[PDB]
Amino acid sequence: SMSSAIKSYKSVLRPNERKNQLLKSTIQCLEDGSAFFFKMLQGLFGGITPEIVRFSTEQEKQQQDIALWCAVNWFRPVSQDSLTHTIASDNLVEKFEEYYGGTASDAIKQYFSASIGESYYWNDCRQQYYDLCRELGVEVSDLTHDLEILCREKCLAVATESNQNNSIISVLFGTGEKEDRSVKLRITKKILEAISNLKEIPKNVAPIQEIILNVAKATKETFRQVYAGNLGAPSTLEKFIAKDGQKEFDLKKLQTDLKKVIRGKSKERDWCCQEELRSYVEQNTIQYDLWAWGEMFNKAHTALKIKSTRNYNFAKQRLEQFKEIQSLNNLLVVKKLNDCSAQDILAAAKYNQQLDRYKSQKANPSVLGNQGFTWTNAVILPEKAQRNDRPNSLDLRIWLYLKLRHPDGRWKKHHIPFYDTRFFQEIYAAGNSPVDTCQFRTPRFGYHLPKLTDQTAIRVNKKHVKAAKTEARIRLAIQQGTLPVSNLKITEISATINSKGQVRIPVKFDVGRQKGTLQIGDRFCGYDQNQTASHAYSLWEVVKEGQYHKELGCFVRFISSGDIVSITENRGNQFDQLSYEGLAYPQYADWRKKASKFVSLWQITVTVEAKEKFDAICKYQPRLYKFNKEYAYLLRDIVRGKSLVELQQIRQEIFRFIEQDCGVTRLGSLSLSTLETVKAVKGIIYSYFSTALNASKNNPISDEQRKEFDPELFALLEKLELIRTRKKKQKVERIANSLIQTCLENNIKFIRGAGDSMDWLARGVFNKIRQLAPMHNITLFGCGSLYTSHQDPLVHRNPDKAMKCRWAAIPVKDIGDWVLRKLSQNLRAKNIGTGEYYHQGVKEFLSHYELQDLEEELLKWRSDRKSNIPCWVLQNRLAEKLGNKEAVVYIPVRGGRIYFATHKVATGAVSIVFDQKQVWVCNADHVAAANIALTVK
RNA sequence: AGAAAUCCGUCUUUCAUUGACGGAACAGAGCAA
DNA sequence: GCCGCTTTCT
DNA sequence: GCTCTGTTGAAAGCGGC
């Protein structure tokens, strides 16, 4: 069909005094109505029966537990706002058996036995339903009749069956003329029988169209009047009559649709308790308005049904946990362990975890919530806009036009403005380009704003320049006549608003037509994050003459590889925000020198000299952000054991280190080193507070006390937390953008990554890509492969398993204890799982470099101090075998930057001969990316 | 319909009134250290 | 034709 | 910060301006 995504915009409304009063009054009215609907629907759902759940689950192609579905609606935890019939924790099972008329199964019994959070209490909603029948003044069975009708019309969400939308309002409380269900049902059954037994199934639809028209006794131009009475959205039959008489015919689909229609319209909607319900609602909320009652019902109904479903699934999950508890419960080895064979002990560990988890589990209470309300057709259309344009200042106002309820009770529409530079740039500004047309005016969708000149004078407040600049750019795009017009064919836009006046603007758009299972010409790719939180991508193409992959079942071709990178320029100098590690050691001499000045005068409490570790830090000549991380750790050490006066002196030092010249608050990229430096600095302040207040086990320190002692430093605590939040969000968005633009520049249509082994950043990037890719008709899949770091591309599972260890390149000089340590470990590693490959890499290293006498020496060696070969013998031999004392040597280390690939699967790879085997020196991150691209899970 | 407004953010010993750039969002509940 | 209302829609 | 379960309606006619 047609695939569709959603972009959205967010801002805050700016009403004048009177319209703000009206808006607040209207939102409060809707919130009170939603609360009433929550309390009411709680009882309504408590009134359901096993018959209703049986009807709403009958066609569900996997069997459902009806008793549990009745439970999660009859008894639920609630806040004391909705608590009306408190039931004790121990009469849940008894009174459920009373209601249902049978023994409660184990799933429901687990649902009742689970803990509930503090301030949440169990509510018996069936007793509430009985009191609802009393308060309405109607019989219990009459309201049950209307409840069955409502659940059959999909006016309510019953277990697996979703609700129509807010159509309950129109169906039950509506004032217009309803359909004529008898005619629809009769025509539908007649055509169903006339189609179920045919002598010849056609290949087109014209014969079936004529059959339908003959049965209903109408023409192609009168069927809507005859069948639907010219009322409502077009039916399936109406769209079937309307279509071309040459299209393929799908008998099974039409039969299924007719059966659905017959099941839905078998019984009419003759009510019993309609008018009492309407009077109840109108007396309790407001006079009848379809939109307002719809909003109240939507809020309440969603809040209830999400918890109903969640608790249903939670009971079954808890039952499985309970069963797996009572399987590993060997009960004497358990007691010995808590006071000897292999898997009994491991199962006992699983048992401890499981029992702890089972004990702690809380059930999900039903809370009304704090969602906003949506106005339909609220934004004034861009071509309908009222623009007080100026020759040097465009009108940056977007106007809503919302109905508000006045204190008299009458509704009236009003205009309320708001500002969003993004919504103005992408959609709402008046475009005039003669030719150009794009969905959204933003670089990822193909449009770049013109850059600014010395002819553009931006003279505004300082806190507006970033906004003003964009306006200037947009205005320039109009002056040159190059601002594209939005091709979204927008007819109406809704707006969601909360009690704080925040507005959310959703925009839905078609992204293209759905894909079809990787034909020839379709390019795909993969990405992977390495150990240092850096991502790499590898592109591939399906080709005609090429190399076959058993997993994919087609011929594939490597295109290129690369690293995911987001570059910002600064007076011509480029910076990769995702990886920039700061200045080089000979560039921040003054910063390090001031730090040395401070650190010389102090000690660490065993006493040391505290300048000792500082010089240790400087030994390796690290870059600025690595230096800053380690020096934050140093300051944290220097704080651990000091006095109040000493702390004051230290505090003067901390404030400079954080706030001045290179501190994390002024300098720092989006790299892992900066993100860890921020955490280290926060730890500095946390230790300062722990020492100043002299905390202990039995001395808690509430943040109230921390702010009371030092407000100006708790300020930095929140400020650094905010910096961390913003940095991480920016980093995830930039990674997703970089990958998406890499795909766009290359006609990539499929991405493969890791997800649904979970980093915070890997998980976040996977979710962000899953969000962004559909917007460009790019298909994302998720492979949970764990061996991607060692698989050999185009060889692993083509047709058989093939892994190789990961290698590293070292010049002859920098060979030391860390080399022979890995050599001896991997040679000794014969069980590590990924240790066979590293052993075999060590042996290949020995065979290639002709050092087999040293393997006999090294099998015992690599000790802490004594039974080692000296750490220059191997230097001398390898130089003697290469002829130079600075020469690249390949060593199989765990986590190296080099992989030995069979095929050229990384950009810039070169071929060499290792152990009399030809091989390509590839970038191991690119190899992992390629392995991810070629996985089929 | 009311001349104002950074929609939310990032980089740089460079902090910029022509520096270069990034982003579907929201609610509740549960969980994990 | 615009606006606000109704209804049904698989 | 994880997930979990959801939302941000679609499509037609009618009658009064």
PDB file of C-alpha atoms in Angstrom, chain A residues 490-623:
ATOM      1  CA  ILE A 490      -2.328  19.468   4.035  1.00  0.00           C
ATOM      2  CA  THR A 491      -6.062  19.972   4.534  1.00  0.00           C
ATOM      3  CA  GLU A 492      -6.162  20.271   8.339  1.00  0.00           C
ATOM      4  CA  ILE A 493      -3.838  20.113  11.344  1.00  0.00           C
ATOM      5  CA  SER A 494      -4.695  19.192  14.923  1.00  0.00           C
ATOM      6  CA  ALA A 495      -3.154  20.550  18.108  1.00  0.00           C
ATOM      7  CA  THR A 496      -2.703  18.873  21.494  1.00  0.00           C
ATOM      8  CA  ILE A 497      -2.649  21.196  24.513  1.00  0.00           C
ATOM      9  CA  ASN A 498      -2.180  20.658  28.259  1.00  0.00           C
ATOM     10  CA  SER A 499      -2.923  22.732  31.359  1.00  0.00           C
ATOM     11  CA  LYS A 500       0.502  24.402  31.073  1.00  0.00           C
ATOM     12  CA  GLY A 501      -0.327  25.773  27.618  1.00  0.00           C
ATOM     13  CA  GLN A 502       2.171  23.593  25.754  1.00  0.00           C
ATOM     14  CA  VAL A 503       1.121  22.779  22.190  1.00  0.00           C
ATOM     15  CA  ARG A 504       2.076  19.735  20.116  1.00  0.00           C
ATOM     16  CA  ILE A 505       1.527  19.783  16.350  1.00  0.00           C
ATOM     17  CA  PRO A 506       1.522  16.404  14.544  1.00  0.00           C
ATOM     18  CA  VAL A 507       2.054  16.214  10.784  1.00  0.00           C
ATOM     19  CA  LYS A 508       1.423  12.930   8.968  1.00  0.00           C
ATOM     20  CA  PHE A 509       2.955  12.283   5.568  1.00  0.00           C
ATOM     21  CA  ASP A 510       3.183   9.438   3.074  1.00  0.00           C
ATOM     22  CA  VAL A 511       6.790   8.263   2.718  1.00  0.00           C
ATOM     23  CA  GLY A 512       6.392   6.168  -0.422  1.00  0.00           C
ATOM     24  CA  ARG A 513       5.131   2.710  -1.301  1.00  0.00           C
ATOM     25  CA  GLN A 514       6.128  -0.410   0.616  1.00  0.00           C
ATOM     26  CA  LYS A 515       9.184  -2.465  -0.346  1.00  0.00           C
ATOM     27  CA  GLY A 516       9.295  -6.042  -1.691  1.00  0.00           C
ATOM     28  CA  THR A 517      11.900  -8.447  -0.235  1.00  0.00           C
ATOM     29  CA  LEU A 518      15.313  -7.445  -1.561  1.00  0.00           C
ATOM     30  CA  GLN A 519      15.375  -7.843  -5.338  1.00  0.00           C
ATOM     31  CA  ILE A 520      18.307  -7.140  -7.647  1.00  0.00           C
ATOM     32  CA  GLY A 521      19.544  -3.559  -7.606  1.00  0.00           C
ATOM     33  CA  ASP A 522      18.432  -2.975  -4.007  1.00  0.00           C
ATOM     34  CA  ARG A 523      21.275  -1.663  -1.842  1.00  0.00           C
ATOM     35  CA  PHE A 524      21.432  -2.419   1.880  1.00  0.00           C
ATOM     36  CA  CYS A 525      23.896  -1.682   4.662  1.00  0.00           C
ATOM     37  CA  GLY A 526      24.788  -2.332   8.269  1.00  0.00           C
ATOM     38  CA  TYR A 527      26.210  -0.429  11.202  1.00  0.00           C
ATOM     39  CA  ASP A 528      27.941  -1.463  14.406  1.00  0.00           C
ATOM     40  CA  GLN A 529      29.212   0.249  17.544  1.00  0.00           C
ATOM     41  CA  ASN A 530      32.661  -0.843  18.709  1.00  0.00           C
ATOM     42  CA  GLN A 531      33.954  -1.014  22.279  1.00  0.00           C
ATOM     43  CA  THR A 532      34.889   2.699  22.348  1.00  0.00           C
ATOM     44  CA  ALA A 533      31.296   3.830  21.590  1.00  0.00           C
ATOM     45  CA  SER A 534      31.991   4.630  17.931  1.00  0.00           C
ATOM     46  CA  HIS A 535      29.853   3.504  15.000  1.00  0.00           C
ATOM     47  CA  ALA A 536      30.881   2.214  11.576  1.00  0.00           C
ATOM     48  CA  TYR A 537      28.853   1.449   8.447  1.00  0.00           C
ATOM     49  CA  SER A 538      29.259  -0.973   5.539  1.00  0.00           C
ATOM     50  CA  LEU A 539      27.282  -0.799   2.277  1.00  0.00           C
ATOM     51  CA  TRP A 540      26.344  -3.698  -0.007  1.00  0.00           C
ATOM     52  CA  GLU A 541      24.357  -4.262  -3.201  1.00  0.00           C
ATOM     53  CA  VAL A 542      22.394  -7.182  -4.639  1.00  0.00           C
ATOM     54  CA  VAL A 543      23.771  -7.931  -8.110  1.00  0.00           C
ATOM     55  CA  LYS A 544      23.202 -10.230 -11.088  1.00  0.00           C
ATOM     56  CA  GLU A 545      26.643 -11.693 -11.800  1.00  0.00           C
ATOM     57  CA  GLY A 546      28.458 -11.827  -8.489  1.00  0.00           C
ATOM     58  CA  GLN A 547      29.261 -13.815  -5.356  1.00  0.00           C
ATOM     59  CA  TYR A 548      26.595 -15.994  -3.758  1.00  0.00           C
ATOM     60  CA  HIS A 549      25.534 -15.787  -0.113  1.00  0.00           C
ATOM     61  CA  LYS A 550      23.743 -18.807   1.332  1.00  0.00           C
ATOM     62  CA  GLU A 551      22.025 -16.791   4.087  1.00  0.00           C
ATOM     63  CA  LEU A 552      20.564 -14.186   1.733  1.00  0.00           C
ATOM     64  CA  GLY A 553      20.038 -16.520  -1.216  1.00  0.00           C
ATOM     65  CA  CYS A 554      21.393 -14.105  -3.832  1.00  0.00           C
ATOM     66  CA  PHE A 555      24.530 -12.521  -5.291  1.00  0.00           C
ATOM     67  CA  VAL A 556      26.017  -9.656  -3.277  1.00  0.00           C
ATOM     68  CA  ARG A 557      28.675  -7.002  -3.835  1.00  0.00           C
ATOM     69  CA  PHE A 558      30.544  -4.814  -1.357  1.00  0.00           C
ATOM     70  CA  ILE A 559      30.331  -1.097  -2.144  1.00  0.00           C
ATOM     71  CA  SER A 560      32.166   0.911   0.515  1.00  0.00           C
ATOM     72  CA  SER A 561      32.708   1.300   4.244  1.00  0.00           C
ATOM     73  CA  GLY A 562      33.232   4.192   6.604  1.00  0.00           C
ATOM     74  CA  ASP A 563      32.863   5.643  10.071  1.00  0.00           C
ATOM     75  CA  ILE A 564      29.747   7.478  11.225  1.00  0.00           C
ATOM     76  CA  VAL A 565      30.801  11.099  11.647  1.00  0.00           C
ATOM     77  CA  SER A 566      29.100  14.445  12.389  1.00  0.00           C
ATOM     78  CA  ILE A 567      31.358  17.403  11.455  1.00  0.00           C
ATOM     79  CA  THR A 568      30.988  20.996  12.555  1.00  0.00           C
ATOM     80  CA  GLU A 569      33.201  23.702  11.060  1.00  0.00           C
ATOM     81  CA  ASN A 570      34.770  26.540  13.052  1.00  0.00           C
ATOM     82  CA  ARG A 571      36.437  29.284  10.985  1.00  0.00           C
ATOM     83  CA  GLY A 572      37.340  26.584   8.485  1.00  0.00           C
ATOM     84  CA  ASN A 573      38.621  23.953  10.933  1.00  0.00           C
ATOM     85  CA  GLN A 574      36.567  20.762  10.992  1.00  0.00           C
ATOM     86  CA  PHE A 575      35.630  18.893  14.166  1.00  0.00           C
ATOM     87  CA  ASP A 576      33.948  15.499  14.529  1.00  0.00           C
ATOM     88  CA  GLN A 577      31.655  16.086  17.501  1.00  0.00           C
ATOM     89  CA  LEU A 578      31.230  12.340  18.032  1.00  0.00           C
ATOM     90  CA  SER A 579      34.956  11.609  18.376  1.00  0.00           C
ATOM     91  CA  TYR A 580      36.979  14.818  18.927  1.00  0.00           C
ATOM     92  CA  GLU A 581      39.340  14.032  21.805  1.00  0.00           C
ATOM     93  CA  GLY A 582      40.486  17.607  22.424  1.00  0.00           C
ATOM     94  CA  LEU A 583      43.810  19.362  22.099  1.00  0.00           C
ATOM     95  CA  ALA A 584      47.175  17.631  21.876  1.00  0.00           C
ATOM     96  CA  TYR A 585      49.493  17.568  24.885  1.00  0.00           C
ATOM     97  CA  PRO A 586      51.775  20.388  23.578  1.00  0.00           C
ATOM     98  CA  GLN A 587      48.711  22.627  23.081  1.00  0.00           C
ATOM     99  CA  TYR A 588      47.151  22.981  26.553  1.00  0.00           C
ATOM    100  CA  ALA A 589      50.357  23.694  28.464  1.00  0.00           C
ATOM    101  CA  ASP A 590      48.862  26.597  30.445  1.00  0.00           C
ATOM    102  CA  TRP A 591      45.862  24.553  31.630  1.00  0.00           C
ATOM    103  CA  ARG A 592      48.052  21.666  32.783  1.00  0.00           C
ATOM    104  CA  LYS A 593      50.517  24.117  34.346  1.00  0.00           C
ATOM    105  CA  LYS A 594      47.877  25.826  36.494  1.00  0.00           C
ATOM    106  CA  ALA A 595      46.633  22.364  37.452  1.00  0.00           C
ATOM    107  CA  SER A 596      50.192  21.416  38.461  1.00  0.00           C
ATOM    108  CA  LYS A 597      50.446  24.606  40.529  1.00  0.00           C
ATOM    109  CA  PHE A 598      47.355  23.590  42.484  1.00  0.00           C
ATOM    110  CA  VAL A 599      48.174  19.911  42.830  1.00  0.00           C
ATOM    111  CA  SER A 600      51.719  20.468  44.114  1.00  0.00           C
ATOM    112  CA  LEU A 601      50.471  22.103  47.334  1.00  0.00           C
ATOM    113  CA  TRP A 602      48.341  19.128  48.443  1.00  0.00           C
ATOM    114  CA  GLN A 603      48.309  15.501  49.566  1.00  0.00           C
ATOM    115  CA  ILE A 604      46.002  12.487  49.345  1.00  0.00           C
ATOM    116  CA  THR A 605      44.991  10.477  52.411  1.00  0.00           C
ATOM    117  CA  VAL A 606      48.915   6.217  52.136  1.00  0.00           C
ATOM    118  CA  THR A 607      49.929   9.903  52.159  1.00  0.00           C
ATOM    119  CA  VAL A 608      51.718   9.979  48.733  1.00  0.00           C
ATOM    120  CA  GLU A 609      52.336  13.547  47.451  1.00  0.00           C
ATOM    121  CA  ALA A 610      49.375  14.052  45.117  1.00  0.00           C
ATOM    122  CA  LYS A 611      51.680  15.614  42.547  1.00  0.00           C
ATOM    123  CA  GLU A 612      53.068  12.084  42.150  1.00  0.00           C
ATOM    124  CA  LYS A 613      49.944  10.778  40.425  1.00  0.00           C
ATOM    125  CA  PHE A 614      49.604  14.040  38.473  1.00  0.00           C
ATOM    126  CA  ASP A 615      53.007  13.469  36.873  1.00  0.00           C
ATOM    127  CA  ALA A 616      51.956   9.847  36.360  1.00  0.00           C
ATOM    128  CA  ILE A 617      48.945  11.217  34.451  1.00  0.00           C
ATOM    129  CA  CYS A 618      51.129  13.504  32.337  1.00  0.00           C
ATOM    130  CA  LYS A 619      53.612  10.701  31.544  1.00  0.00           C
ATOM    131  CA  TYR A 620      51.585   9.369  28.604  1.00  0.00           C
ATOM    132  CA  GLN A 621      51.063  12.888  27.120  1.00  0.00           C
ATOM    133  CA  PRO A 622      47.289  12.444  26.746  1.00  0.00           C
ATOM    134  CA  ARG A 623      44.908  14.752  24.956  1.00  0.00           C
TER     135      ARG A 623
END
